[PDB]
């Protein structure tokens, strides 16, 4: 439901952002005020990633 998959690689630009790899699964906690950033959890930790870089799976 909040289970997602990464569409593209994203390299953390610091400031509480999280690196993710295409194909990786994430759990989504929420979004920032404009929906552009998504706060997510993966095996590598927790942080903000682009909302457009991920999508629900299953």
């Amino acid at each position: 439901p909040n289970l997602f998959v990464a569409l593209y690689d994203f390299v953390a630009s610091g400031d509480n952002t999280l690196s993710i790899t295409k194909g990786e699964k994430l759990r989504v906690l929420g979004y920032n005020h404009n929906g552009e950033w998504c706060e997510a959890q993966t095996k590598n930790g927790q942080g903000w990633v682009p909302s457009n870089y991920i999508t629900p799976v299953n």
């Binding site: 569409l7 400031d15 509480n16 920032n32 005020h33 950033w37 682009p50």
Partner: peptide, 10 residues
């Protein structure tokens, strides 16, 4: 969340 915009997807 970051104050700047995220990169656009490709």
């Amino acid at each position: 969340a970051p104050t700047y915009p995220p990169p656009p997807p490709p």
